[PDB]
Amino acid sequence: DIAGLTPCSESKAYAKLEKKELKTLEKRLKQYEADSAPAVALKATMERTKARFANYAKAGLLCGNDGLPHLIADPGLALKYGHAGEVFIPTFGFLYVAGYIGYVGRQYLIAVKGEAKPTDKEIIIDVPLATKLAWQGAGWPLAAVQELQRGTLLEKEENITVSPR
Amino acid sequence: FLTIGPGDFLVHHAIALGLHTTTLILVKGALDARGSKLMPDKKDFGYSFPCDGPGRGGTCDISAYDAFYLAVFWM
Amino acid sequence: GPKRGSLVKILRPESYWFNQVGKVVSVDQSGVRYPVVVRFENQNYAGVTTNNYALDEVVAA
Amino acid sequence: MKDFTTYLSTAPVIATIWFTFTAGLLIEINRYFPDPLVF
Amino acid sequence: KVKIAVDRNPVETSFEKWAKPGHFSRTLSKGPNTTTWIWNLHADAHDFDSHTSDLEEISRKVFSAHFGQLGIIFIWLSGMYFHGARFSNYEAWLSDPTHIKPSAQVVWPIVGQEILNGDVGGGFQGIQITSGFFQLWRASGITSELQLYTTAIGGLVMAAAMFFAGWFHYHKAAPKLEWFQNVESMLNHHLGGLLGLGSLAWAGHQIHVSLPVNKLLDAGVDPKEIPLPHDLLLNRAIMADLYPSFAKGIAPFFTLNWSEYSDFLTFKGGLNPVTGGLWLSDTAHHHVAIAVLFLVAGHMYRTNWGIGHSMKEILEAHRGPFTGEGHVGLYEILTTSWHAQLAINLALFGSLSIIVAHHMYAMPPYPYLATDYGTQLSLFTHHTWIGGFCIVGAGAHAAIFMVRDYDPTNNYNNLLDRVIRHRDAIISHLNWVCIFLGFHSFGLYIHNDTMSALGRPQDMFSDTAIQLQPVFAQWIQNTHFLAPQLTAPNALAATSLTWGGDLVAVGGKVAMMPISLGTSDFMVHHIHAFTIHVTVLILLKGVLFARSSRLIPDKANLGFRFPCDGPGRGGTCQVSAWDHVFLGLFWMYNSLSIVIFHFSWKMQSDVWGTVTGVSHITGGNFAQSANTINGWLRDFLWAQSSQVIQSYGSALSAYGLIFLGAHFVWAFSLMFLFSGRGYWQELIESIVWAHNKLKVAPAIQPRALSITQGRAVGVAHYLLGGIATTWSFFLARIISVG
Amino acid sequence: WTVPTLNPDTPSPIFGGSTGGLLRKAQTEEFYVITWEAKKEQIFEMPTGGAAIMRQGPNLLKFGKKEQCLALTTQLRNKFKLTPCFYRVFPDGKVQYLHPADGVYPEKVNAGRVGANQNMRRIGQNVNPIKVKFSGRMMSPAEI
Amino acid sequence: AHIVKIYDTCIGCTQCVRACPLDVLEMVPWDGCKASQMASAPRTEDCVGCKRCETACPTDFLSVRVYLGSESTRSMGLSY
Amino acid sequence: YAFQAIDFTTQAALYTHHQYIAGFIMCGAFAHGAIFFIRDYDPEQNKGNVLARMLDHKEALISHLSWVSLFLGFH
Ligand code: CLA
Ligand code: CLA
Ligand code: CLA
Ligand code: CLA
Ligand code: CLA
Ligand code: CLA
Ligand SMILES: CC1=C(/C=C/C(C)=C/C=C/C(C)=C/C=C/C=C(C)/C=C/C=C(C)/C=C/C2=C(C)CCCC2(C)C)C(C)(C)CCC1
Numbered sequence A: 001d002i003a004g005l006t007p008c009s010e011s012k013a014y015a016k017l018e019k020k021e022l023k024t025l026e027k028r029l030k031q032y033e034a035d036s037a038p039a040v041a042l043k044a045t046m047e048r049t050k051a052r053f054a055n056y057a058k059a060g061l062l063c064g065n066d067g068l069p070h071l072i073a074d075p076g077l078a079l080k081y082g083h084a085g086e087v088f089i090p091t092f093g094f095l096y097v098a099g100y101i102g103y104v105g106r107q108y109l110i111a112v113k114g115e116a117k118p119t120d121k122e123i124i125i126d127v128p129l130a131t132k133l134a135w136q137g138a139g140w141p142l143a144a145v146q147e148l149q150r151g152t153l154l155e156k157e158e159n160i161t162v163s164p165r
Numbered sequence B: 001f002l003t004i005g006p007g008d009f010l011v012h013h014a015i016a017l018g019l020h021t022t023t024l025i026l027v028k029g030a031l032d033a034r035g036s037k038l039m040p041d042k043k044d045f046g047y048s049f050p051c052d053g054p055g056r057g058g059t060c061d062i063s064a065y066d067a068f069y070l071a072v073f074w075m
Numbered sequence C: 001g002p003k004r005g006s007l008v009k010i011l012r013p014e015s016y017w018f019n020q021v022g023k024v025v026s027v028d029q030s031g032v033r034y035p036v037v038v039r040f041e042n043q044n045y046a047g048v049t050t051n052n053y054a055l056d057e058v059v060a061a
Numbered sequence D: 001m002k003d004f005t006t007y008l009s010t011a012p013v014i015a016t017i018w019f020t021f022t023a024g025l026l027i028e029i030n031r032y033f034p035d036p037l038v039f
Numbered sequence E: 001k002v003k004i005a006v007d008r009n010p011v012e013t014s015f016e017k018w019a020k021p022g023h024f025s026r027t028l029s030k031g032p033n034t035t036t037w038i039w040n041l042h043a044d045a046h047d048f049d050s051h052t053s054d055l056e057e058i059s060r061k062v063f064s065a066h067f068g069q070l071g072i073i074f075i076w077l078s079g080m081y082f083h084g085a086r087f088s089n090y091e092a093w094l095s096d097p098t099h100i101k102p103s104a105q106v107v108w109p110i111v112g113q114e115i116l117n118g119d120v121g122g123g124f125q126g127i128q129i130t131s132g133f134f135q136l137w138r139a140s141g142i143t144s145e146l147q148l149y150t151t152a153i154g155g156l157v158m159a160a161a162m163f164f165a166g167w168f169h170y171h172k173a174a175p176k177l178e179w180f181q182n183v184e185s186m187l188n189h190h191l192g193g194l195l196g197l198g199s200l201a202w203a204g205h206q207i208h209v210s211l212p213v214n215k216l217l218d219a220g221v222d223p224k225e226i227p228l229p230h231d232l233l234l235n236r237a238i239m240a241d242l243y244p245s246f247a248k249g250i251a252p253f254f255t256l257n258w259s260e261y262s263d264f265l266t267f268k269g270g271l272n273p274v275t276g277g278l279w280l281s282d283t284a285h286h287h288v289a290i291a292v293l294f295l296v297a298g299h300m301y302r303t304n305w306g307i308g309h310s311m312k313e314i315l316e317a318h319r320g321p322f323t324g325e326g327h328v329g330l331y332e333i334l335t336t337s338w339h340a341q342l343a344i345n346l347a348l349f350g351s352l353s354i355i356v357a358h359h360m361y362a363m364p365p366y367p368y369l370a371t372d373y374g375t376q377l378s379l380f381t382h383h384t385w386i387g388g389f390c391i392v393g394a395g396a397h398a399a400i401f402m403v404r405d406y407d408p409t410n411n412y413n414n415l416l417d418r419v420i421r422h423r424d425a426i427i428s429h430l431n432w433v434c435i436f437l438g439f440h441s442f443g444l445y446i447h448n449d450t451m452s453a454l455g456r457p458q459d460m461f462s463d464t465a466i467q468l469q470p471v472f473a474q475w476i477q478n479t480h481f482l483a484p485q486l487t488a489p490n491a492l493a494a495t496s497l498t499w500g501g502d503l504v505a506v507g508g509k510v511a512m513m514p515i516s517l518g519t520s521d522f523m524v525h526h527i528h529a530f531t532i533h534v535t536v537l538i539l540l541k542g543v544l545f546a547r548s549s550r551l552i553p554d555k556a557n558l559g560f561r562f563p564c565d566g567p568g569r570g571g572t573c574q575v576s577a578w579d580h581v582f583l584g585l586f587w588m589y590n591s592l593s594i595v596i597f598h599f600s601w602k603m604q605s606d607v608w609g610t611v612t613g614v615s616h617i618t619g620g621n622f623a624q625s626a627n628t629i630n631g632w633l634r635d636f637l638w639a640q641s642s643q644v645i646q647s648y649g650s651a652l653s654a655y656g657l658i659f660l661g662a663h664f665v666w667a668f669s670l671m672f673l674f675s676g677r678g679y680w681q682e683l684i685e686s687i688v689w690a691h692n693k694l695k696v697a698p699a700i701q702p703r704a705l706s707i708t709q710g711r712a713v714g715v716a717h718y719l720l721g722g723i724a725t726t727w728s729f730f731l732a733r734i735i736s737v738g
Numbered sequence F: 001w002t003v004p005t006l007n008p009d010t011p012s013p014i015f016g017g018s019t020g021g022l023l024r025k026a027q028t029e030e031f032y033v034i035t036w037e038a039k040k041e042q043i044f045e046m047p048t049g050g051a052a053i054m055r056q057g058p059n060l061l062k063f064g065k066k067e068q069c070l071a072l073t074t075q076l077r078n079k080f081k082l083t084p085c086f087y088r089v090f091p092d093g094k095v096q097y098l099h100p101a102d103g104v105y106p107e108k109v110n111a112g113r114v115g116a117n118q119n120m121r122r123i124g125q126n127v128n129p130i131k132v133k134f135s136g137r138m139m140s141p142a143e144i
Numbered sequence G: 001a002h003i004v005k006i007y008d009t010c011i012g013c014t015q016c017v018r019a020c021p022l023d024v025l026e027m028v029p030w031d032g033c034k035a036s037q038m039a040s041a042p043r044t045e046d047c048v049g050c051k052r053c054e055t056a057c058p059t060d061f062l063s064v065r066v067y068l069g070s071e072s073t074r075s076m077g078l079s080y
Numbered sequence H: 001y002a003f004q005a006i007d008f009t010t011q012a013a014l015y016t017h018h019q020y021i022a023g024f025i026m027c028g029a030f031a032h033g034a035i036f037f038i039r040d041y042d043p044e045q046n047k048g049n050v051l052a053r054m055l056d057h058k059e060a061l062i063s064h065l066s067w068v069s070l071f072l073g074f075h
């Protein structure tokens, strides 16, 4: 398919690796009882192994010569061959939660600078104000692009600068 | 034009890490050589001076020579 | 220059609080070279929060 | 009790409680959704 | 007049000061302005001398602190017993000690970490533990998980009692200074009651519980079938069935016919051959003797009656012509300065831990311990490290005394003064002897490396070329082995197999055999002497020049912990005694790493192994390979690192992960050790600018770490990295080849 | 105030003798001699290590470098409220008085002192190092 | 000898003088500040360059500056 | 060269030899650039040009180098 990679459900080293992990787990399994808790834990392990290999073969991942899933990081090639779930949807999910954390921290900083003890509200966290901003932070991309377009996202050149500049 | 794979991906990323980081120390040493906010008159001591003493919280390896020195390790 | 308690902006370039805002304590009326006493709510690397400045190093902003 | 809540509002206690919540949330998600790599 | 003295209700129990960080320090109670404050808050949290000048308040603080420590340790012991009862294979191990691996930790089945639960035997899965608790519990006579559970509850109750005792003796009834200064009474009570009654009550438990249960366990009867300990106390007929002495009761004790107690108070020596541990009858006699000795020792100092010695009088009585006033003033020093006491107690406590390591490897006191090679390596290594750290601490607090508490107008022409007054001679001689030791010890290795590389093995220092035999140690060994025949007539065997003699094996494994000392042993012992002498040089120089030197004449006014006195006079970085502790820490790591490497390789090469002759774990390569650095590099590190580097995909994979992680942390320390805070402060300036541009600059100002904190972080990550590396190497190696 | 003279026949403090005293610098180059007058007999701390008893009256010690005499001066001045003065002595026998060189201690203003090494400008008003290239030596821009 | 300079931002707080371990600095009459005092460095031949004066100076930036220069036996702090 | 790339030790030695030479020479380039800033740079001769404007946005430069170094290192 992409880059000479076969799909994992078509790959043979993928099936060999699945069979090898089952072989190691059953060689460890064959030295216990039946209803014993080590045997129960190893059968749960084998169930999770089979479920994991079936889910990775179901998700349409691409395997190499080693039988291991390879990820495709190109928006157009991923959206063309059905691989947006591995890099593209995770990167927009990450950027949503990372801007969430950063915007809630920025709103807490701006809220606590407007008092007579900003360092005291930085050492001892104002929990109601922090939870208020943490719930209100869900509209952070809209609020961020609005603060961008008003010219209030950015401080002017009243910043601290060195002698050189 | 050797065949490349995910190991080659990870190592070229580590290479970019090393290049950007060494460039960070060297560019910081070049541009903070005239002076910084910790030491505004760094040009008056020259290129390779030891320090400016334990005052102002202590200033160890503050010189541009010392920034070079820290960047030879990253090289 | 500026009166007591008013806010100024520091333009001495090698100051720690250059391009930032402090508060005037007093202005000495002798022939002293740096009469404007300004306090800053943050400390420098020496842990000092107060410095003398000149008339052309402070701007009432 | 007010002073005990101020002590619980101090920084390392809130870092401990919040990282316990975040780590437990990720642990719970990795238990009920075992081994996620995609989507 | 020795009496109880206490102030009523000094400090109110309130949550107010919990809500005010840094309340204890007048400087730090102002609040935070830069980030440095936080670090200061944690660094000076327990430096009670910098809080108050009042010795009474300081003494009370340290007393309740000690109670807190004891409560924490009791929580820890409670945890170990509870995990040994609920999450272990202890009973199965009791039923088959030679083929079941001790395990008392299990992991949950999430994110694949379940693989760490390996096949330890007994129908159990977990991580093999190497603390030696199973052998301790079998030696104590514990047979069921229920007894361990009850011990866990007991230890938790005792932890609650210790934390109540802390709160009580700080907030409700806090002892006075003249209570704390009753050192004669304190020595009497600790030598009698603690050591004396401790070993007496333990000998009681041994004689009454340990001996019969372990005698039956060595006889072979099933643990569940063995009578419970309370039945042994209740029905003395069973005790008379195993040891007929108990039939006569306590009549031979009071009538002084003690010879009839020879059934359980013995002097056999050696090891129990079916069990590989010291005879519990020998251990019982030993604890009875120790008990009587310490109870005699605890009645030496005068308290509320005329009889008894006086510490100041014994000190002031020993004066000679060479030393002048002699030990005058030392009583005053050791009853007013906590740091001096802490220095002495740390030195002897560390040394004692190292002696514990050696005597416990050499004379295995617990059953099925000597053949649990992982437990032996772990215990020796652990207690050696603890020892070394406490010695460095001793040097640290000695220097802290020298700077803060030393006052020469009560200390004028004294032992301490003369030491201070000829410190240049002391340090110069120590300097020379360190260089001498370094040259000849390390130079033999470099010489051997060169000769071996040049194809001239006949010119090396080895057992077949130019021999350097440890004649003195061999003579002491031979004397020790021949001692039972002449100089200790009542001894059936030597105190340890390593002196010479036969061979005790358990389950096909070698418990202990005679250790032979040759040229390689000569060379490593002189390496040890060298490294120890250098560590002593650094620490002793630190304490002798803590106050002044020709470079810094007024160093005392700068404190114990300070970065320097500026780049002038050529440069004065690391002139403080704290910095001498910092370097001594690195040198202590060096020394003890070579010590534990010596132990590991020597045991695996010349002692341990299976009995068919004995096939050793590394075939006996020590005597020929341990003379070159290339030999240590190839036959020890490279060869034995196989197990750790190929531990992936098994239960030992965590040791590979911690191998890599420890290498990483060690390397991560080098950034702090090799760099300086000026660069980092300027970098932080640029980053602060970036945060200012986006209105996210914090009100607490980001500062680079202090010079001394950079050094502290450096040495801490350095030690953690290196020590954890050797930990993972050792454990993976000895568990896979054990 | 006039410049005092060194009396070499001044009794020394009671001291058993350290290994941290003088060296060949005292015989070849220079050594310094510190002199004070005490009010009572009292134990102090020697800057080279150890304890010593000062006498009641004139005292006399001799040190290698200058910072040792400053350290003993600071100790005797802040702890005992004494007024010492220490000199510079050469193997020729040349005796150079100093501290207090004016007779009044330098931590307070005295009329008659000439100000030396005073740049009458800010530190930010110094020139760039390009303006002081190719003089007879290495120069800093603050030298001019 | 080390180059020690005094700048006109001095407020005559005497902190540098009481911080120098060598008696190099002293206070002179002046009119530029309210204290009517200025520091001065007439004995820089005995200066070792420890920079205690610079640590003690309160002004921002420094009014006393130590430029490490050519070394002698006095500036290296040698007792031998 | 003829029968290079069949001498594998020659291949590895020459590659590693010119790569370490290149790294030292790049560090020296940035070192002598910092020496240029301290000794030779006249600001009045360069009032407004590209070399002065680099000193004007040096904080943005070091900030974005710090960002790319931290990003590549973490990931
Ligand atoms: C980070 C840099 C980067 C690089 C090196 C690539 C590389 C590639 N892109 Mg991708 N792409 C990227 C980021 C990048 N992309 C981003 C951020 C987006 C969202 C704006 C896209 C959206 C996208 C689409 C819709 C498509 C590609 C395609 C491609 C492949 C061929 C095009 C090419 O050679 O242009 C060099 C790349 C750049 C100069 C970077 C800018 C990318 C622009 C914005 C889009 C280029 C699309 C191109 C005009 C379509 C060519 C069609 C092709 C059949 C000839 C090539 C592997 C095409 C493909 O699927 O090939 C099989 C394709 O259809 N890309
Ligand atoms: C013979 C009685 C006796 C005993 C057994 C002890 C035992 C101890 N004291 Mg000592 N002490 C005593 C008398 C005694 N003391 C007297 C008379 C004085 C005044 C001169 C002191 C003054 C003193 C100070 C200042 C300190 C100690 C400390 C200690 C502990 C050292 C830690 C350790 O390694 O123990 C191993 C641990 C154990 C054996 C745990 C068992 C401990 C329990 C409480 C039994 C000990 C008996 C105890 C005295 C009874 C208290 C009853 C109470 C309800 C009134 C140890 C528990 C140090 C300490 O740690 O404080 C907490 C400490 O700082 N003691
Ligand atoms: C130090 C710890 C220790 C303890 C606790 C014991 C305890 C015991 N040993 Mg001993 N033993 C020890 C060390 C110890 N031993 C050592 C070191 C040796 C070697 C010399 C021996 C050698 C030895 C032999 C050979 C024998 C014992 C025996 C005994 C048992 C009876 C002894 C006796 O009659 O005491 C005297 C009685 C007392 C001390 C009475 C206790 C006081 C009572 C409880 C006070 C109650 C007062 C209160 C108000 C009333 C309760 C009211 C309440 C209900 C409300 C007893 C369990 C005998 C035995 O039974 O073997 C199985 C026995 O034959 N031991
Ligand atoms: C390989 C690593 C290494 C080596 C070789 C050294 C060597 C030394 N350290 Mg150092 N140290 C080290 C790491 C090392 N250190 C590190 C990493 C730290 C940071 C924590 C320190 C911090 C430190 C402290 C705090 C101290 C030392 C001291 C010493 C000296 C000990 C005196 C001695 O044994 O002389 C014998 C010489 C040797 C053992 C070196 C090898 C000599 C070879 C075998 C023979 C030389 C002959 C040669 C081949 C001929 C060359 C001819 C050629 C030029 C033509 C010794 C020179 C101590 C000191 O100087 O006090 C005495 C001291 O106090 N070091
Ligand atoms: C550092 C410790 C050390 C020691 C003890 C030795 C010892 C030796 N080397 Mg080796 N060597 C070393 C380090 C050492 N080496 C190192 C680091 C290297 C690498 C550079 C070498 C490389 C090397 C080579 C290539 C060779 C040797 C050889 C030898 C042997 C002959 C040397 C000789 O003839 O010198 C002459 C002897 C002296 C100069 C004696 C001077 C020292 C005296 C005895 C001190 C006495 C002090 C006294 C007690 C003070 C009393 C005072 C009182 C009177 C007042 C000898 C066994 C040779 C050999 O083949 O050996 C078999 C040889 O070919 N070595
Ligand atoms: C393995 C060793 C090691 C590592 C990992 C680093 C990492 C770093 N160096 Mg350093 N450095 C090192 C050795 C190392 N250095 C040595 C030997 C020297 C010679 C003195 C230097 C000298 C040096 C200079 C001059 C500079 C750096 C800089 C950096 C940072 C560059 C940006 C980056 O990639 O960060 C990525 C972040 C990491 C690699 C850190 C990992 C983060 C951990 C995994 C997160 C926490 C994990 C876990 C929760 C921890 C729990 C533990 C608990 C007890 C708290 C980075 C943190 C630059 C810098 O600081 O720029 C901002 C910089 O200018 N270094
Ligand atoms: C891809 C390709 C191409 C293109 C290419 C290019 C365009 C390239 C470029 C490249 C580049 C573009 C590079 C660059 C580099 C740079 C560097 C390497 C730099 C360095 C720098 C420095 C080192 C600096 C220094 C200094 C300082 C710091 C100060 C001032 C002075 C001075 C300047 C000296 C072609 C089409 C042909 C072909 C196809 C492929």
Ligand code: SF4
Binding pocket: B050, B051, B052, B053, B054, B058, B059, B060, B061, E563, E564, E565, E566, E567, E571, E572, E573, E574, E676, E707
């Ligand atoms: S320690 Fe750091 S600061 Fe103090 S002198 Fe040495 S280098 Fe300069």
Ligand code: SF4
Binding pocket: G006, G009, G010, G011, G012, G013, G014, G015, G016, G017, G038, G039, G056, G057, G058, G059, G063, G064
């Ligand atoms: S220089 Fe700085 S320190 Fe010395 S006097 Fe003038 S102000 Fe006070």
Ligand code: SF4
Binding pocket: E568, G004, G019, G020, G021, G022, G023, G024, G025, G046, G047, G048, G049, G050, G051, G052, G053, G054, G066
């Ligand atoms: S550096 Fe040392 S000597 Fe020179 S002035 Fe500052 S303090 Fe006095």
